[PDB]
C-alpha cells in the first residue's frame, strides 16, 4: 500500500479506504474492481528488492501511522515519514510455511522442517486421481481441514484439498513407548 | 485445482525452476583477499537483453 | 505441487562452499520465504518465493 496524506488532516494514511474494500468485496460476491484497478488507481504499488532501498515501510496498516500485559507490543513510531506499508506481514511466508499455525510461536528450524515435511504429507493431490495414471499416488481416506487454520489457507485452497487428519493428541508419558 | 504452469513431456509433468543469477548491466565492486595479487575488481555482466 | 511451481534454484554447487550464499540476506524479506527450504546439501540455495 502507498502511504500519502492526500488530505488536510496532516497525518499520513494509506491510499486504500473502506469504500475501496467494500467495492472489492462486492465484486467478490457478484462473481468491476480487481487488483488491476487497484494498481491503476494507485492504491497498491509494486516494490522490488532494489527499490526497497529507499522506502520506509509501515508494519501495521493502521497502528504505526498515527495495555493488556499479554497483548502485542510494537516499537514506537518515531518516524512520521512512512511511504508504504505491508498489506499483511504473514505474506512474507511461502506456500508451505503459511500452512503452519503460529509460526512466530514456533522455533524457526521447526518451521523449516515443517515446510519440508508438508510437501511429503499425505492428502488429495488432485480431484482427478481416478483418471491420472501417476507413477506413485497417495490418497488419504478421510482428509480433514485442520481446526487451526491460517487465513492464507483459503488462497492456498488447503481446506478444499487438505492433507492430514485431526487426532486427539495427549502430551502424555504413558507406556514408555 | 490444478494450477497449470508445467509441461507435459513424454506424458510426465515437468516444471522449470527459476534460476538465480547476478543481474546484467550493473557495476559490482568486490574486494579480493591478500594472497590474490588482484585487488578491487569491478565486474559488469554486460549483455544485450 | 504449489511449492514446486513456486520454487527457485541457485546455480552454486551443492558441495561444501561458503555459507554466505546459503544464508538469507535481509533483502529476502517478502520475496523468499524465510522458513521454506530443503534440508541437507541444498539448504539455503534452493529458495521458495
Amino acid at each position: 500500500f502507498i502511504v500519502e496524506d492526500d488530505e488536510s488532516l496532516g497525518h499520513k494514511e494509506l491510499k486504500v479506504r473502506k469504500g475501496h474494500i467494500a467495492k472489492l468485496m462486492a465484486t467478490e460476491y457478484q462473481d468491476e474492481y480487481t487488483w488491476s484497478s487497484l494498481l491503476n488507481e494507485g492504491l497498491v504499488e509494486y516494490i522490488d528488492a532494489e527499490e526497497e532501498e529507499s522506502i520506509l515501510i509501515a508494519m501495521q496498516p493502521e497502528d504505526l501511522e498515527p495495555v493488556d500485559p499479554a497483548k502485542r507490543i510494537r516499537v514506537s513510531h518515531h518516524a512520521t515519514t512512512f511511504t508504504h506499508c505491508e498489506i499483511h506481514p504473514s505474506m512474507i511466508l511461502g506456500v508451505a510455511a503459511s500452512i503452519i499455525p503460529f509460526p512466530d510461536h514456533n522455533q524457526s528450524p521447526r518451521n523449516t522442517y515443517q515446510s519440508a515435511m508438508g510437501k511429503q504429507a499425505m492428502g488429495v493431490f488432485l480431484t482427478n486421481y481416478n483418471v491420472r495414471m501417476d507413477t506413485m499416488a497417495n490418497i488419504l481416506y478421510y482428509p480433514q481441514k485442520p481446526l487451526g487454520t491460517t487465513r492464507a489457507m483459503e488462497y492456498l485452497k488447503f481446506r478444499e484439498l487438505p492433507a492430514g487428519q485431526n487426532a486427539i493428541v495427549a502430551i502424555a508419558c504413558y507406556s514408555g513407548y | 485445482f490444478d494450477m497449470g504452469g508445467y509441461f507435459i513431456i513424454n506424458g510426465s509433468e515437468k516444471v522449470l525452476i527459476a534460476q538465480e543469477r547476478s543481474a546484467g548491466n550493473i557495476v559490482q565492486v568486490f574486494k579480493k583477499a591478500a594472497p590474490s595479487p588482484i585487488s578491487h575488481v569491478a565486474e559488469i555482466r554486460s549483455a544485450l537483453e | 505441487t504449489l511449492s514446486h511451481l513456486r520454487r527457485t534454484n541457485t546455480p552454486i554447487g551443492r558441495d561444501g562452499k561458503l555459507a554466505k550464499p546459503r544464508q538469507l540476506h535481509n533483502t529476502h524479506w517478502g520475496l523468499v520465504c524465510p522458513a521454506e527450504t530443503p534440508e541437507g546439501q541444498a539448504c539455503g540455495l534452493v529458495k521458495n518465493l
Binding site: 473502506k18 467478490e28 480487481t34 496498516p61 487465513r151 488462497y155 492456498l156 | 504452469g5 | 511451481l5
Partner: peptide, 30 residues
C-alpha cells in the same frame, strides 16, 4: 464513510483480490 481509515482485518480482501486475478502460478504463466 467511504474515505475512512482502513483496518488490518480488511486488508485480507485486498489479498483475496491479488490471488483472484494472479493466482499462484502467475509468474510461470506470464
Amino acid at each position: 464513510d467511504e474515505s475512512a481509515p482502513i483496518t488490518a482485518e480488511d486488508s485480507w480482501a485486498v489479498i483475496s483480490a491479488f490471488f483472484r486475478e494472479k493466482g499462484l502460478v502467475s509468474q510461470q504463466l506470464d
